[PDB]
């Protein structure tokens, strides 16, 4: 109908509005800042026991325990201080793509090519880990899952939708639609009232958990987005795509701020994360390496080499003491 031309009008209006708000680039304002300098981090621990590629990890809230998921159908909980194994949960399906840790430390979740999110009760009255709840209803593979609290969980799948579940009953309360391609990542806000999702339509979207509607849409990338992560402030986030570039978007300014690219890098980004103060941006790559970026400068400050295969997962502790990188060569590494 005429609706196509009306949509085109609104698209052009939005672009004009954001152009007015642009008065000075992040680089100009942060030019005076003294460079952070070279960063030298070194493997402190190496965790071994996985016999296949590791696809995900998630730190505990106490910055001591962590969970890892691997293609050999194992969910191992480690003790990063002493490299001890605390649990080893066998999965019914070995095609697992994501894992989570409850903010209390009482539950873990996993999912993958089977379109099911499975929740496991860690601390029970018998000391044996059993599957408490399996949540079904997605049409495509499960890409990511984050524990909102001890009772609610947010998941994203390949059916171009995200959902909010109620673990006690098992039915999804809210469904978030609007994405055009597969949703690949997800990140909750510090106050757990908003979250962002990156999809294969080269667009990120901000969602309201309570209302279930899309507030803002960000589109600067040229290919699918593999990773997303909120700034510690909660007013910005960073994206990683197959375009071999990272980008920082701000919610209030509603536009891109800075780009983290190098002509020597041609491989895509698999995972991104920030530091405690937000001054560092750590990103894993397909060239077997992790690159530290200066979030306020777009200048590299170090390289965490040491993995023999593709770095697939990456996470920084709540207290910011250490960073853990897992990879396709079945090895975890805590760097600090």
């Amino acid at each position: 109908d005429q609706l196509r031309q009306e949509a085109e009008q609104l698209k052009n209006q939005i672009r004009d509005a954001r152009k007015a708000c642009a008065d000075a680039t992040l680089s100009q304002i942060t030019n005076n800042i003294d460079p952070v300098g070279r960063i030298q981090m070194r493997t402190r621990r190496t965790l071994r026991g996985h016999l296949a590629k590791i696809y995900a990890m998630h730190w505990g809230t106490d910055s001591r325990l962590l969970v890892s998921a691997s293609q050999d159908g194992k969910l191992i909980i480690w003790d990063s201080y002493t490299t001890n194994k605390v649990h080893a949960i066998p999965l019914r399906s070995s095609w697992v793509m994501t894992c989570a840790y409850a903010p209390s430390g009482n539950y873990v979740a996993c999912g993958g090519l089977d379109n099911i999110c499975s929740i496991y009760n860690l601390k029970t009255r018998e000391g044996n880990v059993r599957v408490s709840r399996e949540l079904a209803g997605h049409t495509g593979y499960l890409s990511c899952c984050r524990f909102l609290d001890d009772n609610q969980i947010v998941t994203s799948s390949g059916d171009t939708t995200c959902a909010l579940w109620d673990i006690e009953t098992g039915q999804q309360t809210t469904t978030f639609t609007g994405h055009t391609g597969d949703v690949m990542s997800l990140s909750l806000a510090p106050d757990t009232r908003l979250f962002v999702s990156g999809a294969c339509d080269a667009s990120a979207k901000l969602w309201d958990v309570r209302e279930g509607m899309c507030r803002q849409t960000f589109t600067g990338h040229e290919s699918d987005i593999n990773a997303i992560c909120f700034f510690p402030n909660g007013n910005a986030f960073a994206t990683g795509s197959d375009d071999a570039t990272c980008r920082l978007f701000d919610l209030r300014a509603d536009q891109e701020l800075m780009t983290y690219s190098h002509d020597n890098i041609i491989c895509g980004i698999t995972s991104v994360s920030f530091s405690k103060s937000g001054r560092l941006l750590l990103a894993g790559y397909d060239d077997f390496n992790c690159n530290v970026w200066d979030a306020l400068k777009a200048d590299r400050a170090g390289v965490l080499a040491g993995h023999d295969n593709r770095v697939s997962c990456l996470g920084v502790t709540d207290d910011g003491m250490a960073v853990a990188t897992g990879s396709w060569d079945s090895f975890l590494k805590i760097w600090n």
């Binding site: 708000c21 642009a22 800042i33 952070v36 701000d250 701020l257 103060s277």
Partner: protein, 56 residues
């Protein structure tokens, strides 16, 4: 198809009718948070081996 097109227009309208601040203020508040919490960043400022829990 018309229903889908209508949905798209309505969504774009909502996203267009929001309040946006100037990139200058946004960039300043990011720099200010980064500066303010620089002392509590173990990765930024390497921690004494005595207080380092992954070595001693």
């Amino acid at each position: 198809s018309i229903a889908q097109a209508r949905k798209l227009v309505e969504q774009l309208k909502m996203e267009a009718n929001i309040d946006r601040i100037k990139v200058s203020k946004a960039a300043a508040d990011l720099m200010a948070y980064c500066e303010a919490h620089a002392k509590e960043d173990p990765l930024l400022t390497p921690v004494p081996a005595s207080e380092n829990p992954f070595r001693e």
